Structure 1
Amino acid sequence: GFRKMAFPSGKVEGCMVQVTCGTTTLNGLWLDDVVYCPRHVICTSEDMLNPNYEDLLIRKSNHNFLVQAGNVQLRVIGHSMQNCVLKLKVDTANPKTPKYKFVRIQPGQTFSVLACYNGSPSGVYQCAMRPNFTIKGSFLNGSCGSVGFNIDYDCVSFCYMHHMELPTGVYAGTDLEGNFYGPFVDRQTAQAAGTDTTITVNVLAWLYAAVINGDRWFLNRFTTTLNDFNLVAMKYNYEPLTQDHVDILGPLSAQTGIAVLDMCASLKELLQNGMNGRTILGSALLEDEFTPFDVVRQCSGVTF
Structure 2
Amino acid sequence: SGFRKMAFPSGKVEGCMVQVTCGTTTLNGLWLDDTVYCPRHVICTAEDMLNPNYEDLLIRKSNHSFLVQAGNVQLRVIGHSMQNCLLRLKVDTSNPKTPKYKFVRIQPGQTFSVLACYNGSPSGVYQCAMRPNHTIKGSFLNGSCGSVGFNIDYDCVSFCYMHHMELPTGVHAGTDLEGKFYGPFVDRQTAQAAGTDTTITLNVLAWLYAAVINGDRWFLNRFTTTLNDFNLVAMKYNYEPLTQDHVDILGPLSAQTGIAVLDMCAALKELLQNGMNGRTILGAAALEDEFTPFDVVRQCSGVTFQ
TM-score (norm 1): 0.98
Closer, same or farther in 2 for the Cα pair 1:183/1:302, shift >3 Å? farther
Distance in 1 (CA, whole Å) between partners of 2:212 and 2:3 is 11
User: Do the aligned residues in 1 keep the contact of 2:34 with 2:94 (CA within 8 Å)?
Assistant: yes
Q: Deviations over 1:92-132 (max 9, x none)?
A: 00000000000000111110000000000000000111111
Sort the Cα spacing of 1:106 and 1:225 in 2 relative to 1 into closer, same or farther, 3 A.
Answer: same
Cα deviation for residue 169 of structure 1 reads 1.1
The C-alpha deviation readout for 1:260-292, integer Å capped at 9, x for no partner, is 001001100111111111110011111110000
Greater than 2 Å deviation, 4+ residue runs: 300-304
- Please tell me whether the aligned partners of residues 153 and 303 of structure 1 are also in contact (alpha carbons under 8 angstroms): no
Q: Show CA shifts across 1:57-82 (max 9, x none).
A: 11111001000000000000001100
> How far apart are the structure 1 equivalents of 2:300 and 2:195?
33
Q: Work out the number of aligned pairs and report it.
A: 304
Instruction: Indicate how the Cα distance of structure 1 residues 301 and 39 shifts in structure 2: closer, same or farther if over 3 A, else same.
Output: farther
- The offset of 1:50, in angstroms, is 1.2
Taking a change above 3 Å as real, the CA distance of residues 159 and 143 of structure 1, as seen in their structure-2 partners, is: same
Q: 1:296 and 1:35 mapped to 2: Cα distance? A: 35
Seen in structure 2, the aligned counterparts of structure 1 residues 302 and 13 have a Cα distance that, compared at 3 Å, is farther
In structure 1, the partner of 2:120 is 119
Q: Deviations over 1:178-236 (max 9, x none)?
A: 00000000011121221111110100000000011122111112110100001111111
The alpha-carbon deviation at position 84 of structure 1 amounts to 0.2
Q: 1:86 matched to which residue of 2?
A: 87
Give the conservation status (yes or no) of the 8 Å contact 2:214–2:304: no
Are residue 34 (structure 1) and residue 35 (structure 2) matched? yes
Q: Is the 8 A contact 1:115 1:146 kept in 2?
A: yes
Q: Is the 8 A contact 2:78 2:92 kept in 1?
A: yes
CA apart distance, 1:303: 19
CA contact (8 A) 1:128 1:135 kept: yes
State the secondary structure of the residue aligned to 1:300: coil
Give the direction of change, closer, same or farther, for the CA distance of 1:286–1:276 in structure 2 (3 Å limit). Answer: same
Q: TM-score, normalised by structure 2?
A: 0.97
Segments of 5+ residues of structure 2 without an aligned counterpart are none
Following superposition, the deviation at residue 300 of structure 1 comes to 4.1
| 2-structure distance, mates of 1:188, 1:256 | 49
Matched, 1:262 2:263: yes
Q: Output the aligned Cα RMSD.
A: 2.1
Q: 1:303 to 1:151 in 2, by over 3 A?
A: farther
- Select between 52-61 and 286-295 the one with higher mean Cα deviation: 52-61
Structure 1 match to 2:238:
237
Q: Distance in 1 between matches of 2:270 and 2:160?
A: 36
How far apart are the structure 1 equivalents of 2:290 and 2:303? 18
- Counterpart secondary structure, 2:300: helix
Pick closer, same or farther for the CA change 1:143–1:134 going to 2, 3 Å: same
CA contact (8 A) 2:18 2:69 kept: yes
Can you list the C-alpha shifts for 1:15-48, whole angstroms capped at 9, x where unaligned?
0000000110000000000000000000011111
1:274 paired residue number:
275
Among the aligned pairs, what percent are the same residue? 96
Is the Cα contact below 8 Å between 1:103 and 1:158 reproduced in 2? yes
Question: Does the 8 A contact of 2:213 with 2:301 survive in 1?
Answer: no
